Short mmCIF file of C-alpha atoms and ligand atoms in Angstrom, two decimals:
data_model
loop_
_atom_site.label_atom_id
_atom_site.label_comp_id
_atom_site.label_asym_id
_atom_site.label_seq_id
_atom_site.Cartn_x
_atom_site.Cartn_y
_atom_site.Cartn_z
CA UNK A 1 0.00 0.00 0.00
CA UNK A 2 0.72 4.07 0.18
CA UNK A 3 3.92 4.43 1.97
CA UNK A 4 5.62 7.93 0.50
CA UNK A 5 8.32 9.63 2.04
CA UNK A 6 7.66 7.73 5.38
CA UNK A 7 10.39 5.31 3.64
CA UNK A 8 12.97 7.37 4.43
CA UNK A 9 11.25 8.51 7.94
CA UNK A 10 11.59 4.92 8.90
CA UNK A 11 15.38 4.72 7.83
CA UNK A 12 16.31 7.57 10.12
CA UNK A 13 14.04 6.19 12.96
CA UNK A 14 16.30 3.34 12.82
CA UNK A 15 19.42 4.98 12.90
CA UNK A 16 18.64 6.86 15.90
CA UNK A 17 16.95 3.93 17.98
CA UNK A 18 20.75 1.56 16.92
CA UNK A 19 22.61 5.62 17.65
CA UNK A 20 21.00 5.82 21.31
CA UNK A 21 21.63 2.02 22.40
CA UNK A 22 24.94 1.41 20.99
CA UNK A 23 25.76 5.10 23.04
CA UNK A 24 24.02 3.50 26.42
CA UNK A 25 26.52 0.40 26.45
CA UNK A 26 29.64 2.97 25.47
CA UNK A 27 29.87 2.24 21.53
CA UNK A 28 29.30 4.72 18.90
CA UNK A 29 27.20 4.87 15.85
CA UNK A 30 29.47 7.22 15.03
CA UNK A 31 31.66 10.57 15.05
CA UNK A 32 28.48 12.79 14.49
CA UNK A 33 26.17 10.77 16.74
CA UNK A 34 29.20 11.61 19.80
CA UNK A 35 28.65 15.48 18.62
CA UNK A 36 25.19 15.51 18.45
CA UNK A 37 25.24 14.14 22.30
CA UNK A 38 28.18 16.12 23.86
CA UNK A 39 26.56 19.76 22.09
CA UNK A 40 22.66 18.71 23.38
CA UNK A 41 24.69 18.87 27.08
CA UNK A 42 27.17 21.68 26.17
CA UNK A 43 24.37 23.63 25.60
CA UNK A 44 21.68 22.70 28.34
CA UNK A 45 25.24 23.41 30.42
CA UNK A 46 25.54 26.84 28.82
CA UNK A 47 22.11 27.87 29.01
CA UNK A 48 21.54 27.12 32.79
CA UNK A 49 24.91 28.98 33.97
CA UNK A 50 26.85 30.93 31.49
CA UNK A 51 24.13 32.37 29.07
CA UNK A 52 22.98 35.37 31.52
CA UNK A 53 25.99 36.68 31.65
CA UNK A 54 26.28 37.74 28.01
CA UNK A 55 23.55 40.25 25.90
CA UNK A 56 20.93 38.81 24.45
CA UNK A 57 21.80 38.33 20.81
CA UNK A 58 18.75 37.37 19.39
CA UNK A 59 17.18 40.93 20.67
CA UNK A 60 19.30 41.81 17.14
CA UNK A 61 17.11 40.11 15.03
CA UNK A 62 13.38 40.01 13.71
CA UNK A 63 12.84 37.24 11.45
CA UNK A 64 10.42 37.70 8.93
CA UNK A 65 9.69 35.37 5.79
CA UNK A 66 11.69 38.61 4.36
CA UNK A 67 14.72 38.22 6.22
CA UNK A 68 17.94 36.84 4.30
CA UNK A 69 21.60 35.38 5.39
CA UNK A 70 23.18 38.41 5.09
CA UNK A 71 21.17 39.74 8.14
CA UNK A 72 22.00 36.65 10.48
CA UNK A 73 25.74 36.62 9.61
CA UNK A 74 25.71 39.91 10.72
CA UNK A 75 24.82 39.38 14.38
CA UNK A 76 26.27 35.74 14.58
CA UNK A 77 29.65 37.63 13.63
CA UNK A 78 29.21 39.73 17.08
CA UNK A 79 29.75 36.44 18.80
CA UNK A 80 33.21 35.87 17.08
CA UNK A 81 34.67 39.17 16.47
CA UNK A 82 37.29 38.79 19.34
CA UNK A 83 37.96 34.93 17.90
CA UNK A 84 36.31 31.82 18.13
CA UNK A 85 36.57 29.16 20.71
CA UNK A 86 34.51 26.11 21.91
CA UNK A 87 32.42 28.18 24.02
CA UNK A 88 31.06 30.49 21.39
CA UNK A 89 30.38 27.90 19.24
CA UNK A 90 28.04 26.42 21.67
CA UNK A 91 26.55 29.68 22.34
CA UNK A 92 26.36 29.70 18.23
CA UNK A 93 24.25 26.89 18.95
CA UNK A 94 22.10 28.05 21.88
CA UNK A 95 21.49 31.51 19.84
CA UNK A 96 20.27 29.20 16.77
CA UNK A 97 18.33 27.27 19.28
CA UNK A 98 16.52 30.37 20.80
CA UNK A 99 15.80 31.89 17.49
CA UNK A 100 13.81 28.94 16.47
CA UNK A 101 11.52 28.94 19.68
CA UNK A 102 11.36 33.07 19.51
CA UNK A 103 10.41 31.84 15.80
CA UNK A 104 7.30 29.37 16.87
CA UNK A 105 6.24 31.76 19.41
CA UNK A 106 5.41 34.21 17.03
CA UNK A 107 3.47 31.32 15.42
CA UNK A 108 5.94 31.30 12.26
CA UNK A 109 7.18 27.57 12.59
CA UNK A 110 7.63 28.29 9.09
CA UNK A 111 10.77 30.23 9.50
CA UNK A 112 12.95 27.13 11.62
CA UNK A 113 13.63 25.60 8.38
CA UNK A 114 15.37 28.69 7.46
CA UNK A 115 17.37 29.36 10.39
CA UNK A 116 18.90 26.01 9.76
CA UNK A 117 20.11 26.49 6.45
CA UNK A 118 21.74 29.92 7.80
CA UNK A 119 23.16 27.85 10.49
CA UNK A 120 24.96 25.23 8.81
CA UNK A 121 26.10 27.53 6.12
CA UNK A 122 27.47 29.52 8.83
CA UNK A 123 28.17 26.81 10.02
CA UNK A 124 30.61 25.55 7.13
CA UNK A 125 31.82 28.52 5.73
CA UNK A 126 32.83 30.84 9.47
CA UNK A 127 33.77 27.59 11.84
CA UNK A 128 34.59 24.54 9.91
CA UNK A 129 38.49 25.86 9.31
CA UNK A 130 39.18 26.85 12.91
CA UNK A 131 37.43 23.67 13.97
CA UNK A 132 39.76 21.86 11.53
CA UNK A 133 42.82 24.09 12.23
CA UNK A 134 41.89 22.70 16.36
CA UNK A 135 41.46 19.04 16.41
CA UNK A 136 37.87 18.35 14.84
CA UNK A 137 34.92 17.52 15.93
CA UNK A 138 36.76 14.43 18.22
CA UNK A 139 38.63 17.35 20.54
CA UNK A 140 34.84 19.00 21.02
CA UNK A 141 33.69 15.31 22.26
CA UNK A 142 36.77 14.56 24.49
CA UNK A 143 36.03 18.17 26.34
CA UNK A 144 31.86 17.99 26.15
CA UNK A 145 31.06 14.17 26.08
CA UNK B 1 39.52 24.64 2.22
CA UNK B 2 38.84 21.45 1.88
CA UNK B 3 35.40 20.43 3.74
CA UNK B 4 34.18 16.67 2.71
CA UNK B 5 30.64 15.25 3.09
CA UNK B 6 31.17 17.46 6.58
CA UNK B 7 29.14 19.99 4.83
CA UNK B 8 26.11 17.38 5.18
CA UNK B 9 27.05 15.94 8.77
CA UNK B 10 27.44 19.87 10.01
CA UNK B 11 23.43 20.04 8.12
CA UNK B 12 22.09 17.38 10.58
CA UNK B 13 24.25 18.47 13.78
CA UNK B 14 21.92 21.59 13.68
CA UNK B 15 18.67 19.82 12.51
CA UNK B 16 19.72 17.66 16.15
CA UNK B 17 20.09 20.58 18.38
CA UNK B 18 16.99 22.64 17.15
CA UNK B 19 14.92 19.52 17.40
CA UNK B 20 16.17 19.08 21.23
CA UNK B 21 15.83 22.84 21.86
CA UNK B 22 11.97 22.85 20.57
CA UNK B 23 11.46 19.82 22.42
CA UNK B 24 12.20 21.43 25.92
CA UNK B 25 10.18 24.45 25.04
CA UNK B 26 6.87 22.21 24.55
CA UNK B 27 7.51 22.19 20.49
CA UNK B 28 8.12 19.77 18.03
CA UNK B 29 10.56 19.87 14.84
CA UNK B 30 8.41 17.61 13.67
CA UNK B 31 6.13 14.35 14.01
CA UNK B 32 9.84 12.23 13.64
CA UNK B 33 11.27 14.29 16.50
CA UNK B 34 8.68 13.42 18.62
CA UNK B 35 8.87 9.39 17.75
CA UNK B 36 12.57 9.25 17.90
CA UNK B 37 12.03 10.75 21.79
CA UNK B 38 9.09 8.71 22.49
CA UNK B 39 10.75 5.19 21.13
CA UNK B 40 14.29 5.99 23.33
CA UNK B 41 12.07 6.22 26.18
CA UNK B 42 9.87 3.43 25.39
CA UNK B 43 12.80 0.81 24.34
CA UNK B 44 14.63 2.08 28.10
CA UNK B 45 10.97 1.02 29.53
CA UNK B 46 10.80 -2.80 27.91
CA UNK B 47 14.11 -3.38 28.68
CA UNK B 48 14.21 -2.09 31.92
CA UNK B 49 11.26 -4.16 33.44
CA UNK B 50 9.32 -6.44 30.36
CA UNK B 51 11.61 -7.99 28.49
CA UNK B 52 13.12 -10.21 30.83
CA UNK B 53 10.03 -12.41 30.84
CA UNK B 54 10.64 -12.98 27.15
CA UNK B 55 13.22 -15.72 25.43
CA UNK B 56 15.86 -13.49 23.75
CA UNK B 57 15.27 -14.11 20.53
CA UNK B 58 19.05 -12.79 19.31
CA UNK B 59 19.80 -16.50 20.42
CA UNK B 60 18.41 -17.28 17.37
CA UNK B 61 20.94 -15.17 14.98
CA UNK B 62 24.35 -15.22 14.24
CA UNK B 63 24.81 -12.34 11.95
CA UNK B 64 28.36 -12.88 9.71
CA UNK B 65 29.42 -10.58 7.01
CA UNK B 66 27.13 -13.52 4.87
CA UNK B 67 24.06 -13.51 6.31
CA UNK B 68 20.90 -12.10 4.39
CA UNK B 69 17.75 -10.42 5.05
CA UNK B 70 15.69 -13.52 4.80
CA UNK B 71 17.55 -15.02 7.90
CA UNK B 72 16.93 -11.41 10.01
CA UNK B 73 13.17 -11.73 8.45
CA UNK B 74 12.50 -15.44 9.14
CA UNK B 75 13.33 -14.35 13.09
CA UNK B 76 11.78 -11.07 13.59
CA UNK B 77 8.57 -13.21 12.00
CA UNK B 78 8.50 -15.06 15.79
CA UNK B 79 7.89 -11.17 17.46
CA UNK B 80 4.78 -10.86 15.30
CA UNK B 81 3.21 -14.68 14.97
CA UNK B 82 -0.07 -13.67 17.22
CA UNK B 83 -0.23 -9.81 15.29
CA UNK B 84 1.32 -6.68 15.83
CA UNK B 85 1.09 -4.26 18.56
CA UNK B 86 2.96 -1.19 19.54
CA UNK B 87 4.60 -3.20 22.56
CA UNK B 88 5.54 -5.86 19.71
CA UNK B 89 6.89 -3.03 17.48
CA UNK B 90 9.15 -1.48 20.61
CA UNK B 91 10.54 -5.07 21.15
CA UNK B 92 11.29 -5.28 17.26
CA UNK B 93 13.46 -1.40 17.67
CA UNK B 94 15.08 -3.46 21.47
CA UNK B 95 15.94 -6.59 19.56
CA UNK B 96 17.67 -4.54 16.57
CA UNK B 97 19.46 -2.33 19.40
CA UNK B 98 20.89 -5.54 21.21
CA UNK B 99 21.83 -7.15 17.74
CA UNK B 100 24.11 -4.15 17.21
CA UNK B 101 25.62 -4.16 20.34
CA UNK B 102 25.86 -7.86 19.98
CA UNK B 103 27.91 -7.32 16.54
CA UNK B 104 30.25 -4.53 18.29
CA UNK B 105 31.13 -6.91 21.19
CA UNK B 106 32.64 -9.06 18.53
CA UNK B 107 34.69 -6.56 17.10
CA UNK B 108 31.97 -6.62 13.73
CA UNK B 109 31.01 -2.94 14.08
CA UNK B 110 30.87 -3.33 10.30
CA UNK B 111 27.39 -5.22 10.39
CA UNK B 112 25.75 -2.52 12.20
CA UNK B 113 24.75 -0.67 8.71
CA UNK B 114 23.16 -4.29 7.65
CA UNK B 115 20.90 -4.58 10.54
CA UNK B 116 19.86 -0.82 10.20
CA UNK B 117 19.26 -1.44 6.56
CA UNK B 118 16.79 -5.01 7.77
CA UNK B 119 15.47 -2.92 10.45
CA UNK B 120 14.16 -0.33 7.77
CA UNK B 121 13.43 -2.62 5.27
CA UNK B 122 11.10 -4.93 7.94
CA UNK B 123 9.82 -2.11 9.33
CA UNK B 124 8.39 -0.37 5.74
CA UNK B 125 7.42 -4.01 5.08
CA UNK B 126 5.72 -5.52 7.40
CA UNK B 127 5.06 -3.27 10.10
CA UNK B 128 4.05 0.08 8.15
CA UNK B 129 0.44 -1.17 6.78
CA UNK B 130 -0.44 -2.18 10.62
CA UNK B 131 1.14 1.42 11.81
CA UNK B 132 -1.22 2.92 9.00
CA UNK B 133 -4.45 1.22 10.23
CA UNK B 134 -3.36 1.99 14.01
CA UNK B 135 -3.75 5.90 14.03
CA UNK B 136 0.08 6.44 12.51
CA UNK B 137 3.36 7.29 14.72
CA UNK B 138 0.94 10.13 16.05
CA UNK B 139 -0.80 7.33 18.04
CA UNK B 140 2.61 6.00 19.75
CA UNK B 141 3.81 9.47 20.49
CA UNK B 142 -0.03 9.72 22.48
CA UNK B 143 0.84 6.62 24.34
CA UNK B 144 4.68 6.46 24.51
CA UNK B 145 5.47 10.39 24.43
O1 V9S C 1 20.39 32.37 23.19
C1 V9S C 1 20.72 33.54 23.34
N1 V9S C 1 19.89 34.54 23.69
C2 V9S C 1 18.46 34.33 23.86
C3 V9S C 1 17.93 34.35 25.28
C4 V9S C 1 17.67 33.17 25.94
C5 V9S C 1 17.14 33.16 27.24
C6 V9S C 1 16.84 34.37 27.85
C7 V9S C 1 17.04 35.57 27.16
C8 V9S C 1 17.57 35.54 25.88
C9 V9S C 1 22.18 33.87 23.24
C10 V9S C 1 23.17 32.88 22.97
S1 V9S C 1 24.64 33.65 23.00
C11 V9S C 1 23.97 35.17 23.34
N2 V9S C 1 24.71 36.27 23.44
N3 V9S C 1 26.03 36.10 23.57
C12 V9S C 1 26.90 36.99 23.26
C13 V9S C 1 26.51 38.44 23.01
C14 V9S C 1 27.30 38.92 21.80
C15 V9S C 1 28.79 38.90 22.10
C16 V9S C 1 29.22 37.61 22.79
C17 V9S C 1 30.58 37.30 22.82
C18 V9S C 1 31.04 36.13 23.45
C19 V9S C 1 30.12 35.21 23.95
C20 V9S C 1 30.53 33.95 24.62
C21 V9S C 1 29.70 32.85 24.72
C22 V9S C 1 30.13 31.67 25.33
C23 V9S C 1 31.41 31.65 25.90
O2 V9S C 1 31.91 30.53 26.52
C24 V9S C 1 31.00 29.51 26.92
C25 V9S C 1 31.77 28.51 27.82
C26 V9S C 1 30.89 27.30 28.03
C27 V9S C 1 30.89 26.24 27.12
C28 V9S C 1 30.03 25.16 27.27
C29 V9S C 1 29.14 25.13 28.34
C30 V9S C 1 29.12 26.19 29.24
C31 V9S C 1 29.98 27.28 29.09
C32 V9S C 1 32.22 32.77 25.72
C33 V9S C 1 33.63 32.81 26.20
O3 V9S C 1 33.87 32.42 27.43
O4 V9S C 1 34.49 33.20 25.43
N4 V9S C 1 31.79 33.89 25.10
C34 V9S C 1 28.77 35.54 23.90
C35 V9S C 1 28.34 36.70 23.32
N5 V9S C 1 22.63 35.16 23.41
O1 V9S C 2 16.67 -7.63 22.87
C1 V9S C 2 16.32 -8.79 22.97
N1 V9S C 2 17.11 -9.79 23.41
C2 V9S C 2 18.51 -9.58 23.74
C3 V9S C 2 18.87 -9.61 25.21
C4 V9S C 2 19.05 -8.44 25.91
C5 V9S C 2 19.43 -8.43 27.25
C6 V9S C 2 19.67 -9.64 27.89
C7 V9S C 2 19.54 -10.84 27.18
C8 V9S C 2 19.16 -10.81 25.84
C9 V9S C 2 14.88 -9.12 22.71
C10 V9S C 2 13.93 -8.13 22.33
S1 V9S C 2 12.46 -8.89 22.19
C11 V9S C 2 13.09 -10.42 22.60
N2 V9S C 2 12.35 -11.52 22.61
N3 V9S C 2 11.01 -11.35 22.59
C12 V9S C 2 10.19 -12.24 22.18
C13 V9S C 2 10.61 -13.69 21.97
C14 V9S C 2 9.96 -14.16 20.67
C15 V9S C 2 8.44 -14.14 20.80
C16 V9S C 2 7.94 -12.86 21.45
C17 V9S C 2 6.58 -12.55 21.32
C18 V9S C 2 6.06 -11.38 21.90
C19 V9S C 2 6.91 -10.46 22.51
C20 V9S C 2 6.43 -9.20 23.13
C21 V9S C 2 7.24 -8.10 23.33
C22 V9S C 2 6.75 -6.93 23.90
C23 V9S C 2 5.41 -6.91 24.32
O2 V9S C 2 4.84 -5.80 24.88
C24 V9S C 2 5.69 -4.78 25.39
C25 V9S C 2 4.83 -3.78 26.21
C26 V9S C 2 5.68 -2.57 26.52
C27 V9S C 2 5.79 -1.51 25.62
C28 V9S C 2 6.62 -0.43 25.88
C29 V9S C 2 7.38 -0.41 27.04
C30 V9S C 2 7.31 -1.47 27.92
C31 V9S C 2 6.47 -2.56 27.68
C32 V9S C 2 4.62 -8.03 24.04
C33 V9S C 2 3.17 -8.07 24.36
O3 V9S C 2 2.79 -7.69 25.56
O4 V9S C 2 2.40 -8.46 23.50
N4 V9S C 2 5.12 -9.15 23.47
C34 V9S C 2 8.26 -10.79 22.60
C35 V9S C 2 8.75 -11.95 22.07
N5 V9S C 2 14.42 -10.41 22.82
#
């Protein structure tokens, strides 16, 4: 019968049921599963301790359907103008994070898809070399997982 | 300079985060978030307290780099002889979960992708026309979310 794109739903299902229970008895699905983990806990970490202490970046923004990369590279680039560390790229995170619930708030779910795509081209193109140039994603796990 | 199929992994390391930062705030990323939460939480439930009272069917298996989907199908078949439930269909995700780990243990991480691609295949198969009569994954996330 009519399955449709639930095909590939079911896949991914999969992958993160095998991801979670190979993590609970200290294997790995791999590399990106261990990032996915250690940032979730980075970030909770930030948010409950460290995240008051800075300005509220998102007050920078209004997203509207409207609103284009140029406009979020612009703020993100506040976070890294005196370098970028670890920290700040979990508080890259977070700031993606609260955009997206500011976003559904406002009742335009609409726009999280969006703030995604500016995220992981910001993503690749601002943070990928310094994350390279400092040990990968493997030197994030050993200090957040 | 020179990024790899990082470009993609760095795609669905922020997909990951949002999807846990809407879930804390009462939102959803979407209806596959909310299974992939509920099913973790349901799988730590069997195990935990249920499935001791059944035979463990991975007895039945030896997975080697030359075993076929028939042999995976012929067992997961036992699960299901008296129909399909939801409990039935949590066992199926539990037995997949402990083949993997099974398969790591003896140093044959490299069967893990296999067992995903059964899992999938099973699960679009012979599981996916009973999910479809049974209110959908919105009906599990009711009972299991
Ligand atoms: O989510 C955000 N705002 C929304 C919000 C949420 C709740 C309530 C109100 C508003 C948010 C995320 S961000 C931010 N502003 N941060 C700024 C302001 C712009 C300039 C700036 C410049 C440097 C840093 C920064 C951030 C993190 C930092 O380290 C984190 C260390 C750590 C890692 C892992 C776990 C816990 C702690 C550092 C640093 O020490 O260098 N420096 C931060 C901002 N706002
Ligand atoms: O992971 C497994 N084995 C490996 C293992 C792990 C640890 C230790 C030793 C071995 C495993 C998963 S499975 C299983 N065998 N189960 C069988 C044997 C074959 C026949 C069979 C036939 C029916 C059912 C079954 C399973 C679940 C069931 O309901 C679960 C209800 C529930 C849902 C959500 C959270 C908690 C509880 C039911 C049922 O009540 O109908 N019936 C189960 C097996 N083995």
């Amino acid at each position: 019968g009519p399955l449709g794109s639930m095909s590939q739903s079911n896949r991914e299902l999969v992958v993160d049921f095998l991801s979670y229970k190979l993590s609970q008895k200290g294997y790995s699905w791999s590399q990106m599963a261990a990032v996915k983990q250690a940032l979730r806990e980075a970030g909770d970490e930030f948010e409950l301790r460290y995240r008051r202490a800075f300005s509220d970046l998102t007050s920078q923004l209004h997203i509207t359907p409207g609103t284009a990369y140029q406009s979020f590279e612009q703020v993100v680039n506040e976070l890294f103008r005196d370098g970028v560390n670890w920290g700040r790229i979990v508080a890259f995170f977070s700031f993606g994070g609260a955009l997206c619930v500011e976003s559904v708030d406002k009742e335009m779910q609409v726009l999280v898809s969006r703030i995604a795509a500016w995220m992981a081209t910001y993503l690749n193109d601002h943070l990928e070399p310094w994350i390279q140039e400092n040990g990968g994603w493997d030197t994030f796990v050993e200090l957040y997982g």
